[PDB]
Amino acid sequence: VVQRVEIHKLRQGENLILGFSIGGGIDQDPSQNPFSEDKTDKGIYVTRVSEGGPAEIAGLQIGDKIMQVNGWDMTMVTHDQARKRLTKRSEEVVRLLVTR
């Protein structure tokens, strides 16, 4: 039901990949997010995960519902507010709190 995942970002030049992408956010339309449970579900989900990526390694799964990011509340946020929480340049370890 509720799992805490800690991902260790992979260095590749000036980049640090997470091996997964997200979808959702209050600025998005729940019907385009193949994971939302309904039309009100404006949450952030894990729509994709790379194999061997540092996400999968950590335990990240497809559809996973991110309620947290390094402790930050991602329940009522925009897609871009979330992607920004994850892709911080000055952070190599990101922790997520998800349900499944």
Which domains are assigned to the chain? 1-100 (2.30.42.10)
Q: Which helix H or strand E contains 16, and what residues bound it? A: strand 15-17
Distance CA 41, CA 26 (A): 9
Token pair of 56 as six digits: 């999968």
Q: Count the neighbouring beta carbons within 10 Å of the beta carbon of residue 50.
A: 16
DSSP character at residue 86: H
Listed in sequence order, the residues at least 6 apart from 25 whose beta carbon sits closer than 8 Å to its beta carbon are 42, 43, 44, 77, 78, 79, 80, 81, 82
Distance CA 56, CA 74 (A): 20
For 46, list phi and psi in degrees, rounded to 5.
Answer: -100, 100
- Which residue, among 16, 9, 10, 3, has the nearest Cα to 59 in the 3D structure? 3
- Which residue, among 16, 1, 9, 4, has the nearest Cα to 60 in the 3D structure? 4
Please count the residues of the chain: 100
Q: How was this structure determined?
A: X-ray
Please check whether residue 7 is in contact with residue 96, taking contact to mean a CB–CB distance below 8 angstroms.
yes
